[PDB]
Design a protein around this ligand. Structure first.
Ligand SMILES: C[C@@H]1CC[C@]2(OC1)O[C@@H]1[C@@H](O)[C@H]3[C@H]4CC[C@@H]5C[C@H](O[C@@H]6O[C@H](CO)[C@@H](O[C@@H]7O[C@@H](CO)[C@@H](O)[C@H](O[C@H]8OC[C@@H](O)[C@H](O)[C@@H]8O)[C@@H]7O[C@H]7O[C@@H](CO)[C@H](O)[C@@H](O[C@@H]8O[C@H](CO)[C@H](O)[C@@H](O)[C@@H]8O)[C@@H]7O)[C@H](O)[C@H]6O)[C@@H](O)C[C@]5(C)[C@H]4CC[C@@]3(C)[C@H]1[C@@H]2C
Ligand SMILES: *[C@@H]1O[C@H](CO)[C@@H](O)[C@H](O[C@@H]2O[C@H](CO)[C@@H](O)[C@H](O[C@@H]3O[C@H](CO[C@@H]4O[C@H](CO)[C@@H](O)[C@H](O)[C@@H]4O)[C@@H](O)[C@H](O[C@@H]4O[C@H](CO)[C@@H](O)[C@H](O)[C@@H]4O)[C@@H]3O)[C@H]2NC(C)=O)[C@H]1NC(C)=O
Ligand SMILES: CCCCC/C=C/C/C=C\CCCCCCCC(=O)O[C@H](COC(=O)CCCCCCCCC/C=C/CCCCCC)COP(=O)(O)OCCN
Ligand SMILES: CCCCC/C=C/C/C=C\CCCCCCCC(=O)O[C@H](COC(=O)CCCCCCCCC/C=C/CCCCCC)COP(=O)(O)OCCN
Ligand SMILES: CCCCC/C=C/C/C=C\CCCCCCCC(=O)O[C@H](COC(=O)CCCCCCCCC/C=C/CCCCCC)COP(=O)(O)OCCN
Ligand SMILES: CCCCC/C=C/C/C=C\CCCCCCCC(=O)O[C@H](COC(=O)CCCCCCCCC/C=C/CCCCCC)COP(=O)(O)OCCN
Ligand SMILES: CCCCCCCCCCCCCCCC(=O)OC[C@H](COP(=O)(O)OC[C@@H](O)CO)OC(=O)CCCCCCCCCCCCCCC
Ligand SMILES: CC(C)CCC[C@@H](C)[C@H]1CC[C@H]2[C@@H]3CC=C4C[C@@H](OC(=O)CCC(=O)O)CC[C@]4(C)[C@@H]3CC[C@]12C
Ligand SMILES: *[C@@H]1O[C@H](CO)[C@@H](O[C@@H]2O[C@H](CO)[C@@H](O)[C@H](O)[C@H]2NC(C)=O)[C@H](O)[C@H]1NC(C)=O
Ligand SMILES: *[C@@H]1O[C@H](CO)[C@@H](O[C@@H]2O[C@H](CO)[C@@H](O)[C@H](O)[C@H]2NC(C)=O)[C@H](O)[C@H]1NC(C)=O
Ligand SMILES: CC(=O)N[C@@H]1[C@@H](O)[C@H](O)[C@@H](CO)O[C@H]1O
Ligand SMILES: *[C@@H]1O[C@H](CO)[C@@H](O)[C@H](O)[C@H]1NC(C)=O
Ligand SMILES: *[C@@H]1O[C@H](CO)[C@@H](O)[C@H](O)[C@H]1NC(C)=O
Ligand SMILES: *[C@@H]1O[C@H](CO)[C@@H](O)[C@H](O)[C@H]1NC(C)=O
Length: 1278
C-alpha cells in the first residue's frame, strides 16, 4: 500500500537521504522531482515523508524549518544534551542547579516548536503524530512545564517520570531496529496468555483460601491461668490472660513466633503449653496470611514466580500437616515448570521471526646472519616448540593459583623464583622468534601482539615492584591464562562464534542496563525520603543494608530485583509507604526477568545450536526360558517389591524388633536370587556378548557386591551398609521400557557429551574469576565477636591485638576466599542466587588484614560481583537449556518416522493432508416426540442462552471471593443460603437440556463434564454434614467442600486463544508425565542414600526437628524443596559441620552426631546438576517444542478448528446418514464456508477447473472436495 501515499492522495514534501533535497510540492511549484547531485541519489539507490498537504511552502519560515528538520547535527545536539542531562540527574541535589534545569527544559521546547511548525497549522497534529517518539517528547516536556508553575504544590510523584526521556538514546548504537520491534511484537502477542495467567492465579488463590484460612496465626499458650497467683476466676478473665502477649512462646532473640498446629506430625511445640488459634499476628509484619482473597493472590503469585518460597512452604507445613504438599506440587508443576515456559516460547518465536527479515535482506547482497636466521627459523616453528610452550603455560597456570593465606616462606621463595623463570622464558623465546623470521610480518597476524603486550606487562611488573610500587601489574599478570586459546578446539570455536557475531549481544546488554537505570532513578525519586523521616519502624532503628537513598544503593536494589529476588524488598518499601510499592516491583520484575532475560536465552539459541549334545541342550533351554514374557514380569516385580521395602529402615527400626529379622531373611533370599539368575542369563546370551554390553554390567556389580557382603560371616564382621543399598540401581532397567520413555532417555544419553564440554568451559571461566577473588579478599572476613554472635563496633576493638586483649574471641566466617577451593564454592553460591547476601556483606566491609571491618566502606566493590554474574550466570548457566531444545527436536523427529530431509515447510502440508482421515460428519436429531414437551429444545440452542448462563458462572465466582476470617455471624448464613440458589439452578438447567434431547446426551465432552460436576456439587452439599456423626475435624470439612470449585472452571469454554494454548499443552502430556516419573525415581534414589549418611545430625542451620533426614517421608519433604535449588545453603551448613561431635564409641548406644564434609560437598554439588540443570530444563524443552509447532501450524497451515467448523456446514447443510451430495448445492456450498476454506461466488470456472471424481451418477464423496480445497488454499497462500 506504499503507492497509495506515493500518489495523488496526499503527496510528499521533501527528502534528504544523504546530501540531496528533492522537494515534493503541490505540483504547481515543481522543483527537483527527478528520481546533477540527484540523479546520483538514483545511483545511490541503484526517510522523511512529510505528509504536509495542509498549506503551501511559499518560502516562509517553513523553508528553514524543514532545512533544520532533517540535518546531520540537529539530532546529535539533542542527544548529547540528553546524555549530559541524565548524568547531572545522577547526583541528588545542588543549590542553584535549579536554574540549570531551566535551560535543559527550554532546549526541548525550541526543539518541539521547530519540529511542529515544520509540520502543519493544527490539522495534521491530529493525523500524522501516530509515531510515538513525538508523543514522548511532548508529554514529558508538558510535565516539566506543569511542575514549574505550581511551586511544590504537594505533587512530587510526577517530577520523576521525566527521566524516561533518555529512552530516546537507544537509537545511537548501530543495529538497534531488529531488537526494539522484537520487544514490541513479543508484548503484542503475549497479551493472549496474560489472560489465562490471570484466570489461573485466581482459581489457585480460591483453592488456597479454603485449605489455609487463617491458620498461620497459630501460637503456643500456657495451659491454664494458674493454680494460684493469677487468681481463681477460671472464666472470662481466662480470656484476659491468654491474650497478654508477654507469655507467648519465643525461644530467645527471635522476632517471629513459632507455629504449632495439632494435627498428626507437625509442631507439638513445648511440653507445658498448648496450641491455640486466632490470637493476633501474622509472619513478616502481617503480609503472608491466606485469610482473604488479595493476600491469597499475592502468595500464590509468589509461589508461581518461584521466589523465596521455602519460607511459605515450611510455614504452611508446620501449621497444617505434611500431606498438604499435595497442594504445592500442583501449583509448581502447572504454574512454574509448565506455564512460565509459554512466555519463553512466545519470546523465542517473535525473535526468530524478526531476525529472518533482516538477515535475508543482508544476505541478498654478515651473510651468516640470514644463514642462522634460517637455522633458528628451523628451530622455532618445529612442532616441538608449540608443545613445549603449551606445557609451560599449563605449569604457569598451576604456579599462579596456589596462594594460600599464610603461605610459609618456602612457598614464598618457590613462587617467586618460578615467576622469574617463567617471565624469562617467555621474553627470551618471543624475542628469538622475532629474530627467527619476519621482523615486520610479525605485527601482521592479529594474534602475536597479545604476546608482546603480556611480555611488556611482565617486565614492568618485575620493575615497579622492585621499586616501591605497591600493587602495580600483578593484576594484569592474570592475562596469561587467556593465551590457552590456540590449543583447545572447543574453546577456540566458542570464542570465534561470539567474536564474529557480536552486535546483538552489545545491543541487548545496552537495553538491559538502560532499562534498570531508568527504574533506579524513578525509585530514588519516588520512595526515597520515606526511609529517613520514619527510619524507626524498622526493628532497631537503622537503615537496612538495601535502600533507596543514594543512586548506587538504588541501582543495586533494582538489580537484585531483576536477578529473581523481589519480595524481601517489597516488605520494607510497603512498611513505610502504604502502597505504590506493589506496582513498582511487580513491573520491574515483569519487564525485567521474564522479558529481557528470556530474550537473552532466545539469542544463545540461534548461535550455539558326546556330552556336547546336552551342553547345546542347556544352552537352548536357557535361551528358551530367558525370553518368555512371564519370567521377565516376574524379575521386574521381585525387584520392585524388594526395593520398596528398603524405605522403612528409618530411625526407630530397632524398636520394631521383628522388621530386622524379616529384612535379613529378605536379603538372604535376594542374594540367592541374584546369583541364580546370573547363571541363567549367562548360559543364555553367551559369554562375550555379556561383558561388552552396558546394562548387564550393572547386574554384575550388584551381584559381586552381594557376594562380598555375604561371605563376611566366617569373619563375623557385621555387614557394611553402603553395599547392600546398591540394589536400587537395577530399578533403572525396567523404567526404560514404559510406553513413551524412548524419547526422553535417548535425548539425555545423546546430550551428555555436550553437557561435559560446557562444564569444562565453565570451569575455565570460573578459574579466571577465582584466582582474582583470592588476591582481592583472602585474609579478610575476620571479625572480633563477643561471647554471643555480635560484632564489637569500631572503638571497643580497633584491630586484632585489642581483640585478643580481653578474651573477645576472634572468629572466622564460613564462606570465605582463602584457598582456591573455597573460591569455587562461594562462587557457586553467588551464581545460583542462594545465600549470596552474607558474602556480599563481608566483601563490602573488608577493610584490610588484621583489622576490624567497618559497617560500610569499600562500597565500590560491588562491581566485582556484577561483572562476574553477567558473564557467569546469564551467559553460561543459561546455555544448558540451549542444548536440550535442539536435541529434543531432532530426537522427536527421528523417533516418529517422518524422514529428516524435508526442510521444515512441506511438513506442514504433510500434517495437513494426514489430518484427513477422521472426517465423519453427523447431524443433531432435531425434535422430540410430541410438541410442548419437545418445545423446550427450540431455544436451548441459542446465542442468548449459553451466554445467559456464562454470566451466572462469573457471578458465582464473585460470590466466592468475599469470604474472610472474622466474618460476623450474619454473613455466613446469607452466603450459605445464597449458594443453594445457584446449586439448584445449575442442575435444573442441566436436566432441562438432558430431557430435551432424550438420548444422545453424551456425544460431547463438555456435557459429560457438566453432568459429573453438578452431581458432585449436589452430593458435596449434603456430605457437608461431616459434623455430629463422623470425625469432627477441620482438615476434612475444609477439603470435602472443595467440590463446589469445579463448576467455575467451566468459564474457559469459548475463547479461541485460551483454547489454542490448552490444545498445545494437551498434545504433549505423556512425555511430560514421563519426565516427572524420571525425576521422582531420582529423588527416591537420593532419599534412600540420604537416610543412611545424614540420619544423626546436630540440629543447626535449617534442620528443626521437622525437616531432618530421619524418616523417609520427611526426607522427600526436604528433597522436593532442594530439587529447585531453593535454600541449599542452610542444608549445606547443617550437614557439612564437622566441629564438636561426640564421635561414635562402637561400645554402647552407638551415636553419630557430626556428619562430615567430603560427602557433604559431593552430595549436593551432584544434585544441583542431575536435577536443577538437566531435567527441570527438559520440561522447558518439551513444552517449547510443542507450542512453537502449534503456532506455526495455525498461522500458515490448517488449524485443528478449521475442519470441524467446516463440518458445521454439511452438519446442518445435509442430513445425517449418507455422506454424499449430487453436485448442485456443492457450488454454493463454497459460499457457506469461511475465508480459510472458501472462495467467493465466481467459482463455476474453478469448479470446472478441479477434478472431483463424479462417483455414482449423482453422488459426490466428501474427501475429494476437502482435499481439493486443502491443496487449493495451499496453492493460494503459497
Ligand atoms: C577480567 C576481570 C573482570 C572483572 C573485573 O576484573 C577483571 O574484576 C574487577 C573488580 O574486582 C573490580 C574492582 C577491583 C579493583 C578496584 C579497587 C578499588 O579500591 C579503591 O582503593 C581502596 C582499596 O584498597 C578502597 O578505598 C581505600 O579504603 C582504605 C583501604 O581499605 C584506605 O586505606 C584507602 O586509602 C589509601 O590508603 C593509602 C594508600 O596506600 C591507598 O592507595 C589508599 O588510596 C582507600 O580509602 C579511600 O577510599 C574511600 C574508602 O576508604 C574513602 O573515600 C577514603 O577512605 C578514608 O579516607 C582516608 C584518607 O583519605 C583513608 O584512605 C582511610 O583511612 C579512610 O578509609 C579514601 O578516599 C576503595 O576500594 C577504592 O578507593 C575500588 O574502587 C574498585 C575497583 C576500581 C574495581 C575496578 C575493576 C573491577 C570493576 C573489575 C574488573 C573490571
Ligand atoms: C487443637 O487445635 C484446635 C484448633 O486448631 C484448638 O481448638 C484446640 O485448642 C484448645 O483445646 C483445649 C482442649 O484442652 C480446649 O479447652 C480449648 O477450648 C476452650 O474454649 C473455652 C471457650 O471459652 C469461651 O469464653 C468466651 C469468653 O468471651 C465465651 O464468650 C465463650 O462462650 C466460651 O465460653 C475456654 O473457656 C476454655 O478454657 C477452659 O474452659 C473449660 C470449660 O469451663 C474450663 O473447665 C477450663 O478450666 C478452662 O477454663 C478452652 O480455652 C481449645 N481452644 C479453643 C480456642 O477453643 C487444640 N487442642 C489441643 C488439645 O491441641
Ligand atoms: C499479571 C500478574 C500481576 C498480578 C499479580 C500482582 C500482585 C497482586 C498484588 C495484590 C495486592 C495485595 C492487596 O491488594 O491487598 C490489600 C492490601 O491493601 C494495602 O495495604 C494497599 C492497598 C492495595 C494497593 C492497590 C491494590 C491494587 C494494586 C494491584 C497492582 C496490579 C498491577 C500490576 C502491574 C503490572 C504491570 C505490567 C488488601 O487489603 P485488606 O483488605 O486485606 O486490609 C487488611 C489490612 N491488613
Ligand atoms: C555429566 C552431567 C551429568 C549428566 C546426567 C545424565 C542423566 C542421568 C540420568 C540418565 C538416566 C540413564 C537412562 C539411560 O540412558 O538408559 C539407557 C542407557 O544405558 C546404557 O546404555 C549405559 C548406562 C547404564 C547405567 C545406568 C545409569 C545409572 C546411573 C548410576 C550409575 C552408577 C553405577 C554404579 C538408555 O539407552 P538405550 O535405551 O538406547 O539402551 C541401549 C542398549 N544397548
Ligand atoms: C490416599 C489418601 C489417604 C489419606 C489418609 C487420611 C489422612 O490421614 O489425611 C487426613 C486428611 O488429609 C489432609 O489433611 C489434606 C488432604 C490433601 C489436600 C490436597 C488438596 C489437593 C487440591 C489428615 O488430616 P486429619 O484431619 O484427618 O488428621 C487429624 C487427626 N486427628
Ligand atoms: C557450571 C560449572 C559447575 C562447576 C562446579 C564445581 C564445584 C566444585 C567444588 C569443589 C571444591 C573443591 C574441594 C576442596 C575443598 O573445599 O576443601 C579442601 C579439601 O577438603 C576436603 O575435605 C576434600 C573433599 C573434596 C573431595 C570430594 C569432592 C568430590 C567432587 C565431586 C581443602 O581442605 P580444608 O581447607 O577444608 O581443610 C580443613 C583445614 N582445617
Ligand atoms: C508507579 C508505576 C511505575 C511504573 C514504572 C514503569 C517504567 C517503564 C519505563 C519504560 C520506558 C518507556 C518506554 C516508552 C516507549 C515508547 O513510547 O517509544 C515508542 C517506541 C517506538 O517503537 P516503534 O517500533 O513502533 O517505532 C517504529 C519503528 O521503530 C518500527 O517499528 O516503542 C517501542 O520502542 C516499543 C518498546 C517498548 C518497551 C517498553 C517495555 C515495557
Ligand atoms: C508423580 C507420580 C508419577 C509419583 C507418585 C508419588 C509422588 C506424588 C510422591 C510425592 C508426594 C508424596 C507424598 C507426600 C505425602 C506423604 C505423607 C508423608 O509420609 C508420612 O510419613 C506421613 C506421616 C503420618 O501421617 O503418619 C510424606 C510422604 C508421603 C508418603 C507421600 C510420598 C509419595 C508422594 C505421594
Ligand atoms: C485485664 O483486666 C485488667 C483490669 O480488669 C485490665 O487493666 C486495665 O487496662 C486498661 C487498658 O486501657 C487500663 O486503662 C486500665 O487502667 C487497667 N486497669 C486498671 C485497674 O488500671 C487489662 O487491660 C485487661 N487485659 C487486657 C489485655 O486488656
Ligand atoms: C502482661 O503480664 C505482665 C506480667 O504480669 C504485666 O506486667 C504487670 O504490669 C503491671 C502494671 O502495668 C504491674 O503492676 C505488674 O507488677 C506487672 N507484673 C509483673 C509480674 O511485674 C503486664 O501488664 C501484662 N500486660 C498487660 C497489657 O497488662
Ligand atoms: C586468665 C586470663 O587470661 N584472664 C584475662 C587476662 O589475661 C587479661 O589480661 C584480662 C584483660 O583485662 O582479661 C582476663
Ligand atoms: C475465688 O472465688 C471463689 C468464688 O466463691 C471463692 O470462694 C474463693 O475464695 C476465691 N479465691 C480465693 C483464693 O479466695
Ligand atoms: C548474650 O546475650 C544475652 C541476652 O540475650 C546476654 O546475657 C549477654 O549479652 C550474652 N550472654 C552471655 C552469657 O554473655
Ligand atoms: C600487634 O601485635 C603484633 C604481633 O606480631 C605486633 O607486632 C604489633 O606491634 C602489635 N601492635 C599493637 C599496636 O599492639
Amino acid at each position: 500500500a506504499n503507492k497509495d501515499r506515493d500518489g495523488s492522495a496526499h503527496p510528499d514534501q521533501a527528502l534528504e537521504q544523504g546530501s540531496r533535497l528533492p522537494a515534493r510540492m503541490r505540483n504547481i511549484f515543481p522543483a527537483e522531482l527527478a528520481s546533477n547531485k540527484k540523479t546520483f541519489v538514483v545511483v545511490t539507490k541503484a526517510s522523511g515523508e512529510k505528509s504536509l498537504w495542509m498549506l503551501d511552502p511559499f518560502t516562509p519560515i517553513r523553508r528553514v524549518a524543514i532545512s533544520t528538520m532533517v540535518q546531520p547535527i540537529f539530532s546529535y545536539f539533542i542527544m548529547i544534551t540528553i546524555l549530559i542531562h541524565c548524568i547531572f540527574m545522577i547526583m541528588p541535589a545542588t543549590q542553584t542547579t535549579y536554574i540549570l534545569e531551566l535551560v535543559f527544559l527550554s532546549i526541548y521546547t525550541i526543539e518541539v516548536v521547530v519540529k511542529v511548525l515544520a509540520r502543519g497549522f493544527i490539522l495534521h497534529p491530529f493525523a500524522y503524530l501516530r509515531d510515538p517518539w513525538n508523543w514522548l517528547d511532548f508529554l514529558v516536556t508538558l510535565i516539566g512545564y506543569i511542575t514549574l508553575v505550581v511551586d511544590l504544590g504537594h505533587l512530587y510523584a510526577l517530577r520523576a517520570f521525566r527521566v524516561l526521556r533518555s529512552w530516546r538514546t537507544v537509537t545511537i548504537v548501530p543495529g538497534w531496529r531488529t531488537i526494539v520491534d522484537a520487544l514490541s511484537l513479543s508484548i503484542t502477542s503475549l497479551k493472549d496468555l496474560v489472560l489465562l495467567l490471570l484466570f489461573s492465579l485466581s482459581v489457585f488463590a480460591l483453592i488456597g483460601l479454603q485449605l489455609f484460612m487463617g491458620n498461620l496465626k497459630h501460637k503456643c499458650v500456657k495451659h491454664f491461668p494458674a493454680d494460684g497467683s493469677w487468681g481463681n476466676f477460671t472464666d472470662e478473665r481466662w480470656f484476659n490472660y491468654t491474650s497478654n502477649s508477654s507469655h507467648w512462646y519465643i525461644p530467645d532473640d527471635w522476632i517471629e513466633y513459632p507455629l504449632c498446629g495439632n494435627s498428626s506430625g507437625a509442631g507439638m511445640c513445648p511440653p507445658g503449653y498448648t496450641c491455640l488459634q486466632g490470637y493476633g499476628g501474622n509472619p513478616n509484619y502481617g503480609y503472608t496470611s491466606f485469610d482473604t482473597f488479595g493476600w491469597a493472590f499475592l502468595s500464590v503469585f509468589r509461589l508461581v514466580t518461584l521466589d523465596y518460597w521455602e519460607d511459605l512452604y515450611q510455614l504452611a507445613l508446620r501449621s497444617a500437616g505434611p500431606w498438604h504438599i499435595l497442594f504445592f506440587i500442583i501449583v509448581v508443576f502447572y504454574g512454574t515448570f509448565c506455564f512460565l515456559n509459554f512466555i519463553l516460547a512466545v519470546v523465542v518465536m517473535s525473535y526468530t521471526h524478526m531476525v529472518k527479515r533482516a538477515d535475508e535482506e543482508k544476505a541478498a547482497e654478515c651473510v651468516p646472519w640470514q644463514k642462522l636466521q634460517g637455522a633458528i627459523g628451523a628451530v622455532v616453528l618445529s612442532p616441538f616448540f608449540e608443545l613445549f610452550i603449551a606445557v609451560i603455560i599449563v605449569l604457569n597456570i598451576t604456579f599462579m593459583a596456589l596462594d594460600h593465606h599464610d603461605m610459609n616462606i618456602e612457598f614464598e621463595r618457590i613462587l617467586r623464583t618460578g615467576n622469574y623463570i617463567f617471565t624469562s622464558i617467555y621474553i627470551v623465546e618471543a624475542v628469538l622468534k622475532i629474530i627467527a623470521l619476519s621482523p615486520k610480518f610479525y605485527f601482521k597476524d592479529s594474534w602475536n601482539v597479545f604476546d608482546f603486550i603480556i611480555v611488556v606487562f611482565a617486565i614492568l611488573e618485575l620493575g615497579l615492584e622492585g621499586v616501591q610500587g605497591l600493587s602495580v601489574f600483578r593484576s594484569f599478570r592474570l592475562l596469561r591464562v587467556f593465551r590457552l586459546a590456540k590449543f583447545w578446539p572447543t574453546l577456540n570455536n566458542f570464542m570465534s562464534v561470539m567474536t564474529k557475531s557480536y552486535g546483538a549481544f552489545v545491543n541487548v546488554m545496552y537495553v538491559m542496563f538502560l532499562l534498570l537505570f531508568i527504574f533506579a532513578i524513578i525509585g530514588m525519586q519516588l520512595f526515597g525520603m520515606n526511609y529517613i523521616d520514619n527510619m524507626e519502624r524498622f526493628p532497631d532503628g537503622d537503615l537496612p543494608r538495601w535502600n533507596f537513598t543514594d543512586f548506587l544503593h538504588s541501582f543495586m536494589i533494582v538489580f537484585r530485583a531483576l536477578c529473581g529476588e523481589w519480595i524481601e524488598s517489597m516488605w520494607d518499601c510497603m512498611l513505610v509507604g502504604d502502597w505504590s510499592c506493589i506496582p513498582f516491583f511487580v513491573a520491574v520484575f515483569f519487564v525485567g526477568n521474564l522479558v529481557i532475560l528470556n530474550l537473552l536465552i532466545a539469542l544463545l539459541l540461534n548461535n550455539y545450536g558326546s556330552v556336547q549334545r546336552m551342553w547345546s541342550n542347556i544352552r537352548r533351554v536357557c535361551f528358551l526360558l530367558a525370553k518368555n514374557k512371564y519370567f521377565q514380569k516376574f524379575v521386574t516385580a521381585v525387584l520392585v517389591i524388594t526395593s520398596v521395602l528398603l524405605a522403612l529402615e528409618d530411625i526407630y527400626l530397632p524398636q520394631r524388633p521383628v522388621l530386622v529379622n524379616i529384612t535379613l531373611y529378605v536379603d538372604y533370599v535376594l542374594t540367592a536370587f541374584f546369583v541364580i539368575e546370573m547363571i541363567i542369563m549367562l548360559f543364555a546370551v553367551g559369554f562375550k556378548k555379556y561383558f561388552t554390553s552396558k546394562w548387564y554390567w550393572l547386574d554384575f556389580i550388584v551381584v559381586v557386591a552381594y557376594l562380598l557382603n555375604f561371605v563376611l560371616m566366617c569373619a563375623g564382621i557385621e555387614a557394611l551398609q553402603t553395599l547392600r543399598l546398591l540394589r536400587v540401581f537395577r530399578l533403572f532397567r525396567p523404567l526404560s521400557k514404559v510406553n513413551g520413555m524412548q524419547v526422553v532417555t535417548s535425548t539425555l544419553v545423546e546430550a551428555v557429551p555436550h553437557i561435559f564440554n560446557v562444564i569444562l568451559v565453565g570451569i575455565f571461566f570460573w578459574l579466571v574469576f577465582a584466582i582474582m577473588g583470592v588476591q582481592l579478599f583472602a585474609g579478610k572476613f575476620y571479625k572480633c565477636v563477643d561471647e554471643n554472635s555480635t560484632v564489637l563496633s569500631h572503638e571497643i576493638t580497633m584491630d586484632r591485638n585489642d581483640c585478643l586483649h580481653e578474651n573477645y574471641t576472634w572468629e572466622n566466617s564460613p564462606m570465605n576466599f582463602d584457598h582456591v577451593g573455597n573460591a569455587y564454592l562461594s562462587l557457586l553460591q553467588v551464581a545460583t542466587f542462594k545465600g549470596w547476601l552474607q558474602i556480599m556483606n563481608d566483601a563490602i566491609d573488608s577493610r584490610e588484614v588484621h583489622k576490624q571491618p567497618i559497617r560500610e566502606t569499600n562500597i565500590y566493590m560491588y562491581l566485582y560481583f556484577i561483572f562476574f554474574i553477567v558473564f557467569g550466570s546469564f551467559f553460561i548457566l543459561k546455555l544448558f537449556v540451549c542444548i536440550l531444545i535442539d536435541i529434543f527436536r531432532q530426537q522427536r523427529r527421528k523417533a516418529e518416522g517422518l524422514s529428516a530431509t524435508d526442510s521444515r515447510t512441506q511438513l506442514i502440508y504433510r500434517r495437513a493432508v494426514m489430518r484427513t482421515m477422521s472426517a465423519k460428519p453427523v447431524k443433531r436429531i432435531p425434535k422430540p416426540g410430541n410438541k410442548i414437551q419437545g418445545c423446550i429444545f427450540d431455544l436451548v440452542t441459542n446465542q442468548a442462552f449459553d451466554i445467559s448462563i456464562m454470566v451466572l458462572i462469573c457471578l458465582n465466582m464473585v460470590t466466592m471471593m468475599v469470604e474472610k476470617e472474622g466474618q460476623s455471624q450474619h454473613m455466613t448464613e446469607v452466603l450459605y443460603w445464597i449458594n443453594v440458589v445457584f446449586i439448584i439452578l445449575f442442575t435444573g438447567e442441566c436436566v432441562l437440556k438432558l430431557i430435551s434431547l432424550r438420548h444422545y446426551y453424551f456425544t460431547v465432552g463438555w456435557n459429560i463434564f457438566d453432568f459429573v460436576v453438578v452431581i458432585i456439587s449436589i452430593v458435596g452439599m449434603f456430605l457437608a454434614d461431616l459434623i455430629e456423626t463422623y470425625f469432627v475435624s477441620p482438615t476434612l470439612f475444609r477439603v470435602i467442600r472443595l467440590a463446589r470449585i469445579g463448576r467455575i472452571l467451566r468459564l474457559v469454554k469459548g475463547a479461541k486463544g485460551i483454547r489454542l494454548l490448552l490444545l498445545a499443552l494437551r498434545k504433549a502430556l505423556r512425555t511430560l508425565f514421563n519426565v516427572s516419573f524420571l525425576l521422582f525415581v531420582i529423588m527416591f534414589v537420593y532419599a534412600v542414600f540420604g537416610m543412611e549418611f545424614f540420619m544423626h545430625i546436630r540440629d543447626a542451620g535449617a534442620i528443626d526437628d521437622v525437616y531432618n533426614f530421619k524418616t523417609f517421608g520427611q526426607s522427600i519433604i526436604l528433597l522436593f524443596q532442594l530439587a529447585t535449588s531453593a535454600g541449599w545453603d542452610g542444608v549445606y551448613f547443617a550437614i557439612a559441620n564437622e566441629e564438636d561431635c561426640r564421635a561414635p564409641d562402637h561400645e554402647l548406644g552407638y551415636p553419630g552426631n557430626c556428619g562430615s564434609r567430603a560427602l557433604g560437598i559431593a552430595y549436593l554439588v551432584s544434585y544441583l546438576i542431575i536435577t536443577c540443570l538437566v531435567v527441570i530444563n527438559m520440561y522447558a524443552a518439551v513444552i517449547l517444542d510443542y507450542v512453537l509447532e502449534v503456532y506455526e501450524d495455525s498461522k500458515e497451515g490448517l488449524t485443528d478448528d478449521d475442519y470441524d467448523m467446516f463440518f458445521e456446514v454439511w452438519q446442518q447443510f445435509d442430513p445425517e446418514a449418507t455422506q454424499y451430495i449430487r453436485y448442485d448445492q456443492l457450488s454454493e456450498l463454497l459460499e457457506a464456508l469461511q475465508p480459510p476454506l472458501q472462495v467467493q461466488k465466481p467459482n463455476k470456472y474453478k469448479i470446472l477447473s478441479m477434478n472431483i471424481p463424479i462417483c455414482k451418477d449423482d453422488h459426490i464423496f466428501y474427501k475429494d472436495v476437502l482435499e481439493a480445497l486443502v491443496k487449493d488454499v495451499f496453492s493460494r497462500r503459497g
